Amino acid sequence: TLGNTYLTLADVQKQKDGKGNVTSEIIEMLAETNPILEDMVVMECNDGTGHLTTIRTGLPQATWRRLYEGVQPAKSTTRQIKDSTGTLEAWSEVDEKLVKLSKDKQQLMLNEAAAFLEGMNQTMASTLFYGNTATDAVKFMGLAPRFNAYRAARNLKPVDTADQVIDAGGTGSDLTSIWMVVWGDRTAHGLYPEGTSAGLQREYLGAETKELGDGGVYRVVREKFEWDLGLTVRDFRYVVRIANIDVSDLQAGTIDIYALLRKAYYRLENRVITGGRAALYCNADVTEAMDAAATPTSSTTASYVRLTPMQVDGKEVMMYRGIPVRECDAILSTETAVPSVA
Amino acid sequence: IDVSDLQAGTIDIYALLRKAYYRLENRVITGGRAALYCNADVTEAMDAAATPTSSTTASYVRLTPMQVDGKEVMMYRGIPVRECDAILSTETAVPSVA
Amino acid sequence: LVKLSKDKQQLMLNEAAAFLEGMNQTMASTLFYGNTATDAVKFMGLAPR
Amino acid sequence: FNAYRAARNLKPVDTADQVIDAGGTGSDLTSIWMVVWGDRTAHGLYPEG
Amino acid sequence: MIMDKENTFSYKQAITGTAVSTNVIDLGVSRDIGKGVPVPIIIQVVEDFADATSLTATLQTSETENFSSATTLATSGAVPVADLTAGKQLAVQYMPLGTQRYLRVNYTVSGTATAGAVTAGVVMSHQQN
Amino acid sequence: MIMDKENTFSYKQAITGTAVSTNVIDLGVSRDIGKGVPVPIIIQVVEDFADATSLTATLQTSETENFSSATTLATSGAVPVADLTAGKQLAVQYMPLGTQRYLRVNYTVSGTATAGAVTAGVVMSHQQN
Amino acid sequence: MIMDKENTFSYKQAITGTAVSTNVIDLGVSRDIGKGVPVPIIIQVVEDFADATSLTATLQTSETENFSSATTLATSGAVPVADLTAGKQLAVQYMPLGTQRYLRVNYTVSGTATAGAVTAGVVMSHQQN
Known part of the structure; x- marks a missing residue:
């Protein structure tokens, strides 16, 4: 059965022009843009078991000393958390005659390499935004698994991460989220283990000699594609996400974006002091709606913004509150409910 | 100040801030140095009323493009606003007097 | 124990910073609710008046 | 493009996923266009020779 | 012909x-x-x-x-x-249109057979005369 | 988090x-x-x-x-x-003393479980929340 | 080794x-x-x-x-x-996970022993033979 595993002959026929030469210009039509992996800071773990974060969980609150009293000495407690890196790689397996009869090798390698690069980038962004290693044991913890719980009330100071998520009333499979990460030496950053290298590493293995279980030695060619990284959210005061954003709304005038964004901005307890570069990543539905509520035309019972000629259409959504708004396609408009912590 | 109803905008803040500034009848005859303190909820609502997007139920602040962002609040007619986390968000309700 | 930390200064600085923060938090929070009526060992605050 | 996705899905870009409809259903209908005129966008093929 | 294993x-x-x-x-x-x-x-x-x-x-x-x-x-x-001999083609030359998700060949036979075989599959280039 | 096939x-x-x-x-x-x-x-x-x-x-x-x-x-x-959910460790984070020759994990259960999975094995770098 | 009388x-x-x-x-x-x-x-x-x-x-x-x-x-x-002699570690050589505010160390023995002593607490290093 199958027919989907290796690069069959039909695909090679499809990847060439009518003149009989392999196509140099391939329409992707499935590439995505994800600058999270571009603006992210990453450095080698360069340590033992893993990257280490030290969190304080106790204060030596002073005592109202009466005169002739012995104040009991106090200690400051600390809590430690470590985060690990993850590794994935993908391989290309093609018959050598599949190459030779295509009259062109380097072109076929270029096409397959570009496709593999795009695939890995998309996969990596998807796992960064959703690394639910709770049920994986690989695919290092991303961002959604850490904040996949919100607390409705009592969200005064960041006692847990359930105070870093804002309900928006959504329901159904049309929910989404907005992340506002801060990349910095202490805020949060990417991570790769020592000895390896940053970014995607690709290796051309040349002609192989694929040996079959039942005595078969047909000759194949392979390319290596390797890229590993890990995350470390040192502070849950540096990441705030909005849950239950129902896309049945947000296209009509039912949920105001800037209301939730300001609510979250003030939930970001560590923008009062510069820790590092900030960002607010969206899914291009949020940005569409944001330009729909920042340059309003015939909007529904709202939008105190008052327009002028030459400014009736809209300009851009580049910066939220000085935070650059980088548009990341990895985010999905289906995320399932993030529940309310009781 | 009911934070649950402070987020909804039902309780005005700039009106009651005007009342309090008026209630403090001394600084307009000089004195020392004044300062205003507010928990995250109070300042947040004041920044909201400063730059409304869907505060709804009427408002008279009008914004232009490139201005819907919302700048942080810094003064109240010359009274620096200081972010004092000491003010809690659950305390006694100063029961009805007289 | 301080000598075994191999620094003897960073640990002490950490503990001092924690103690400073604790003290500042305590009087800052009792600067606004330090009711002698509820506990007659601390100076009168701003709310009880 | 003479078919629009009624309940649009976010980015499964299909020919029916690039048409926005609003009203019409009469005899006053018309459309607006957005064509990118570039080499690997869209262009005019004159037959070989 | 150079007909291969996988898409067969x-x-x-x-x-x-x-x-x-x-x-x-x-x-x-x-x-x-x-x-x-x-x-x-x-x-x-x-x-x-x-x-x-x-x-x-x-x-x-x-x-x-x-x-x-x-x-x-x-x-x-x-x-x-009477025509099911060697080389009796049973469909069009090139790939048809409408291959939605999966593809299997049916062989409805009127009655049973004691001999018969086929080699249906994709070929790089046809062989003619 | 890095894992192996054998040390698993x-x-x-x-x-x-x-x-x-x-x-x-x-x-x-x-x-x-x-x-x-x-x-x-x-x-x-x-x-x-x-x-x-x-x-x-x-x-x-x-x-x-x-x-x-x-x-x-x-x-x-x-x-x-109750509990036993995803991400629930159930033993010492590191290898205890007294590893004679081989090692395995026992999973005695007081009854029948209609679901459940484990990933017992050595990990290159533990993942702490 | 160092013993930390406070945690003992x-x-x-x-x-x-x-x-x-x-x-x-x-x-x-x-x-x-x-x-x-x-x-x-x-x-x-x-x-x-x-x-x-x-x-x-x-x-x-x-x-x-x-x-x-x-x-x-x-x-x-x-x-x-039979193996309960001096210097034999009994339990997890490092902290398990889930340590709440208070930690006891229960000593349940089958019957009663007329001898036997055990020490338990944090250290700074080990012996490991």
């Missing part, structure tokens, strides 16, 4: 009874591969048929591993056994 | 009953792996449990391939079906 | 009968020691034992001062009497 429906399969193909070519994405540059296919009968009567040779396509509901893209009709 | 006592292993581990590890000479620099281990539970009552996470070791003679090194008690 | 669950405590360790630690808040740098401890038998059948050194924990709630974090199993 059946290799010398007897289908003497009323059987179906074995290697169901499955594609995760509905490419509908026939468009544009063609792809040659064969359902050429590879060894003669003895006592069959009809060999309806559908090219059923469906949307599930098991063809719960299938769609026909090429049917040879009730070809009488 | 289980991989989403079903515990639908009083099952035991699958990939029993060997170490050549008997040796003691708990000595010296610590070696991590993850007994994280995957595929949240449904109907169990207690999951015994014994960490039996032996000197023979068949665990005729076993030496308990750690345990987690009768952890209820 | 027992110091040459006698093990006749079943009871709990002398010192019940209190880490201020509900912090978990387990996650982070490996904090080493040794529940090691310091003096040999007697006719008692078996020992079951356990590491209970609870948020409350008194351990009205039983939450096991580790267990030595049912260690035999």
Whole structure:
């Protein structure tokens, strides 16, 4: 059965022009843009078991000393958390005659390499935004698994991460989220283990000699594609996400974006002091709606913004509150409910 | 100040801030140095009323493009606003007097 | 124990910073609710008046 | 493009996923266009020779 | 011909009874591969048929591993056994249009057969005369 | 988080009953792996449990391939079906002392569990929340 | 090795009968020691034992001062009497996970021993033969 595993002959026929030469210009039509992996800071773990974060969980609150009293000495407690890196790689397996009869090798390698690069980038962004290693044991913890719980009330100071998520009333499979990460030496950053290298590493293995279980030695060619990284959210005061954003709304005038964004901005307890570069990543539905509520035309019972000629259409959504708004396609408009912590 | 109803905008803040500034009848005859303190909820609502997007139920602040962002609040007619986390968000309700 | 930390200064600085923060938090929070009526060992605050 | 996705899905870009409809259903209908005129966008093929 | 292993429906399969193909070519994405540059296919009968009567040779396509509901893209009709010799093609030259998700070949036979085989599958270039 | 194939006592292993581990590890000479620099281990539970009552996470070791003679090194008690969710470790983060020759994991359950999975095995770098 | 008298669950405590360790630690808040740098401890038998059948050194924990709630974090199993000699570590060489405010170390023995002493607490290093 199958027919989907290796690069069959039909695909090679499809990847060439009518003149009989392999196509140099391939329409992707499935590439995505994800600058999270571009603006992210990453450095080698360069340590033992893993990257280490030290969190304080106790204060030596002073005592109202009466005169002739012995104040009991106090200690400051600390809590430690470590985060690990993850590794994935993908391989290309093609018959050598599949190459030779295509009259062109380097072109076929270029096409397959570009496709593999795009695939890995998309996969990596998807796992960064959703690394639910709770049920994986690989695919290092991303961002959604850490904040996949919100607390409705009592969200005064960041006692847990359930105070870093804002309900928006959504329901159904049309929910989404907005992340506002801060990349910095202490805020949060990417991570790769020592000895390896940053970014995607690709290796051309040349002609192989694929040996079959039942005595078969047909000759194949392979390319290596390797890229590993890990995350470390040192502070849950540096990441705030909005849950239950129902896309049945947000296209009509039912949920105001800037209301939730300001609510979250003030939930970001560590923008009062510069820790590092900030960002607010969206899914291009949020940005569409944001330009729909920042340059309003015939909007529904709202939008105190008052327009002028030459400014009736809209300009851009580049910066939220000085935070650059980088548009990341990895985010999905289906995320399932993030529940309310009781 | 009911934070649950402070987020909804039902309780005005700039009106009651005007009342309090008026209630403090001394600084307009000089004195020392004044300062205003507010928990995250109070300042947040004041920044909201400063730059409304869907505060709804009427408002008279009008914004232009490139201005819907919302700048942080810094003064109240010359009274620096200081972010004092000491003010809690659950305390006694100063029961009805007289 | 301080000598075994191999620094003897960073640990002490950490503990001092924690103690400073604790003290500042305590009087800052009792600067606004330090009711002698509820506990007659601390100076009168701003709310009880 | 003479078919629009009624309940649009976010980015499964299909020919029916690039048409926005609003009203019409009469005899006053018309459309607006957005064509990118570039080499690997869209262009005019004159037959070989 | 340089017909290869993977995208091949059946290799010398007897289908003497009323059987179906074995290697169901499955594609995760509905490419509908026939468009544009063609792809040659064969359902050429590879060894003669003895006592069959009809060999309806559908090219059923469906949307599930098991063809719960299938769609026909090429049917040879009730070809009488008098023509089921070697080289008797049973469908069009190149790939048809409409290959939605999955592809398996049916071999409805009127009555049973004591001999018969086929080599249906994709070919790089046809062989003619 | 980095893991291996050999240094892996289980991989989403079903515990639908009083099952035991699958990939029993060997170490050549008997040796003691708990000595010296610590070696991590993850007994994280995957595929949240449904109907169990207690999951015994014994960490039996032996000197023979068949665990005729076993030496308990750690345990987690009768952890209820409640909790036992994803990301729930159930033993010591590192390898305890007394690793005779081989190692395996026991999964005694007081009843029947209609779901549940484990990923017992050595991990290059433990993942702390 | 260094011993940290402040964290010392027992110091040459006698093990006749079943009871709990002398010192019940209190880490201020509900912090978990387990996650982070490996904090080493040794529940090691310091003096040999007697006719008692078996020992079951356990590491209970609870948020409350008194351990009205039983939450096991580790267990030595049912260690035999024959191997219960001096310098034999009994339980997890490092902190398990889930350490709540208070940590006791239960000493359940099958019957009663006419001898036997055990020390338990954090250290700065080990011996490991």
